[PDB]
Structures are given as structure tokens and as C-alpha cells.
Amino acid sequence: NKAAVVLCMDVGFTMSNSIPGIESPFEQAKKVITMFVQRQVFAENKDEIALVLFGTDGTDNPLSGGDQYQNITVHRHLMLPDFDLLEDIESKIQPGSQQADFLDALIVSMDVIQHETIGKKFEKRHIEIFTDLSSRFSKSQLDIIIHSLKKCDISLQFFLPFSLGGITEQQKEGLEIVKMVMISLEGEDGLDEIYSFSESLRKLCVFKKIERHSIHWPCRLTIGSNLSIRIAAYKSILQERVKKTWTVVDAKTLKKEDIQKETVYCLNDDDETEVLKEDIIQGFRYGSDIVPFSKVDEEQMKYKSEGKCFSVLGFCKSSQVQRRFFMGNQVLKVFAARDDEAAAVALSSLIHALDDLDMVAIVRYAYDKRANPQVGVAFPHIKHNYECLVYVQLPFMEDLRQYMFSSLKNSKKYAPTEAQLNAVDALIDSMSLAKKDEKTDTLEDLFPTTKIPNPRFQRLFQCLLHRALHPREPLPPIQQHIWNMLNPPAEVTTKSQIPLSKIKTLFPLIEA
């Protein structure tokens, strides 16, 4: 569940001295650190992060010894991230003028992550090194370091100014040693685990998505009164809402306890009398009158059912169920009961039969006793890795609207000409968002909308962070990358420039 992350960073002089255009690695590492801190702060995953620096003038480590383990500092211990850490990163950290051996820094990181982890459970442990590998060092304690990392099961990561992994020989030696360390720890797959500052910034510029864990819903899929298969249902797709809501506070003291909310009731008399809650009964409207209907009477007459029912009313061809009739605000995914082989076999048989016959199951679904029953459609979904049923609600008789719309093909005044059709065809061809893979295998989606984070939460977190760090300044404008991700690639517009002009020429649109 929780994770402990010891962020170890370089503050040596070699970082400051660099070409101004190159954006010397100190600033890029600082930006990466800050972005990671914001992502962790605004995503409350209950993760612990500590900060270690090497190459600084001061010395504060649990282990000192002699000349070794010097010029290192442990600025932050294992504790939850907070805005104080962001403020400290922004200004309290400045470049130094000394050098240090990053192997000793790794030793100190191991020491802190092993000493401050007692008393807490951590399913994961990480150590990120931020260095340019431009400091002289000696390799004499690598085997013990690898053994300790293997025994403690602690992952490693490296972030360097260059993507490869024009450089000096010392940088090349650093590359060789880090590559050997990565290979020994994991192997071939570990080679790609050496990121660059620019690439990491490309991935850390977006706040983490709102992640919620669905709770399994057990039930029994029933076909008649003799066949029953144990099943578990999860919520696959639903509209996501902010976990936290705004709190009303008084303008001056800024406290929630100094404001109260309550409701009262009155009559139509001029005196504006008041009545108590218990003296109020619910009623309904029947035409031009009001029919009293007490809550107790409603419960007595209420439609009573038996909860937790997943019954197969029948089987119907897939063509008879249209996507436009889907109801509800959720999609359910039904698997076999966990650790149940017979249920898995039965569900697999049903799914395969439905897929082979091209059929879907019209079923009755009720969440619990006090949940209104629903009629829905369950259809198969077979994939190499997994197979399961997909349930989506269906409409009742009252939910269908009978609206009449005039025909467009039979119209004599709204019939497009051949040139207009050709222009529209050219526009559609130019603005295609799917490209064939050299007309060989399949299609590729140029603008996949399922991988775009919701801009609403991004904007909310951006504004909250800006207010936290700058209490006085107003809110900023929307970030450019949000607009970039909310728009298609520029190639589409470049291709569509001319067809749009042709359509404008051919179609006389006038605003009335």
C-alpha cells in the first residue's frame, strides 16, 4: 500500500558550471523534484518521502567515520509530503562548492531507509539518484552494496542530463559503473530504467489521476430455479467526481465552526408563523389537487422486492439491442467467483455460447433490498487474458420519447449538390483521425481520447497549488499543455486548411 522514497540529489559545483542554453542539470533536477512533490502532495496515497543531498559543505549523517561519508546531509526524514517541503526545495536548497562520492551517498540512503523504516509497513522502497556523474570516485564497495540491495529488495533509479544510457571520460566511467549496477540488480530490463531530466519532466507535468478502488459485488446468476452460478461484479466505467468538496468558512477568521446552516418552515399566513419538522407530512399532486401520503403509509404500500438478484429473464439477438438505448451511469463487469473453478467453467461456457450464437442476456438486476430493480443487457467480452460479461442498463416504457423529425433525404430545398458532396468528402478524408499501418495490419488512433486526463481536476489542482504558494496573486491562466492535449495534432489542421476554405466557398451560411 504505502511506499518509502529516499530522493538523493547532487548539489556539487560541477552542475552549476554548464552552458546557459543547456539549462544546467541543477535547475532541471530541481524542477523534477518539485513536480514529483506536487504530484505526491495532491495525490493522497499515504506515501513517505525523505530528502538526501551530497556534495554540500555541511555534514549531517547517522554515520560519520573518517574522511569517508562527508559532505552529505539528510535534509528530510521519512514523513508525509507537505507544502513545507516545497517551500524548502524552492529556496532553502542552493548549490554548493564541494564534491562527494555517490557510492557513499547510496550507502547513506540505504542507512536511512533501513533505520527509519522500522515500525511501519512498506510494500515498496525506492531510491532515486540525481547526478551528472562528473565527480571523481573509486569503486571498492560495489559487491556489498549489491548484496544489501538484493537482500532488502529496494529498487534503484537514475536521472542524468543525457538520454544515452559529447561527454568527458569521467562521465563515461560513471555511465559504465551505473550500467553495471543496474544490470546486476535486474539485468537487461534495467538498462531502460535510466531516465533523463527532460524525458522525466515530459511525464511529470500532469497531476496524477483520481483513482478509486471498486468493491466487489457478489451474487448468483440464475437461469431458472435450478441453475445458479456464483459471480462477482465490479464497476468498470463511471463518471469521476472530486473526492473532496469546498468548505464554507467565514471571511474574516476563516473557520468552519463559526458558520452554521439550518432550515425552517412557515405558512402562507401574513403572520409568517413557524412549524416544527415533526408536524410536516409529505404529499403528492394528483391533477389540480393534493393527495396527502404519509411516509409510513408509503412504506406500507411500497413496492417490495428481494434484493441482490441477478436473474436471466431471457436471451435475445444482439441486433435487437441498440447502443442508443443504453441507460444508467455505470457499466458492470461480471467475473466468476474468486477461487471458484466450477463457477469459472460455467461462466466461460455461457460466454462462449453467447458469443458463438451472437446473443445477449436480458436480465433483472437489483443492488440490494432498497435498490430499485432494473432491466439490463449482459453481453460477452472475450479477450486473450480474460473473459467476462458486460452489463449495461436498458430503458423502461416510460423512458422512451416519441419525437417526430422531418426527413432530410426527401427535402427539395435542403438537398446538397454534387460539388458540395465532393467538398464534404474531401474534408472527411483530410481530417481522418485514424491511419492505416501502411495498409498492412490494422488501424492506429492518432488522437486517443481515453488516455487524456480530465482537464477539470488538472485545473483545480493547479489553482490550489498556485494559491498555496502565492496567497496574494490571482489565479493564473490555463496551462498550455492542457490545451495541447485537448486539441488534435497540427497535421490534421494543416491538411484540413484547404478543404475548409472550399466548404466555406461552396456553402452560403448566413447568420440570421
Binding site: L313, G314, I362, M397, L400, Q402
Partner: peptide, 23 residues
């Protein structure tokens, strides 16, 4: 117009719901 409800003019009459009728 064919299939027009007498009770509510302008709305096509809705067939009564028969439920499930096995073939």
C-alpha cells in the same frame, strides 16, 4: 395519422408491454 393515440393527440400510441414471450 395512422398509429396516433386518441387520448393524447400528437403522440403515437404505445403498444402494451407484453414482457417475455418465448418462441
Amino acid at each position: 395519422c395512422p398509429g396516433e393515440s386518441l387520448i393524447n393527440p400528437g403522440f403515437k400510441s404505445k403498444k402494451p408491454a407484453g414482457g417475455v414471450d418465448f418462441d
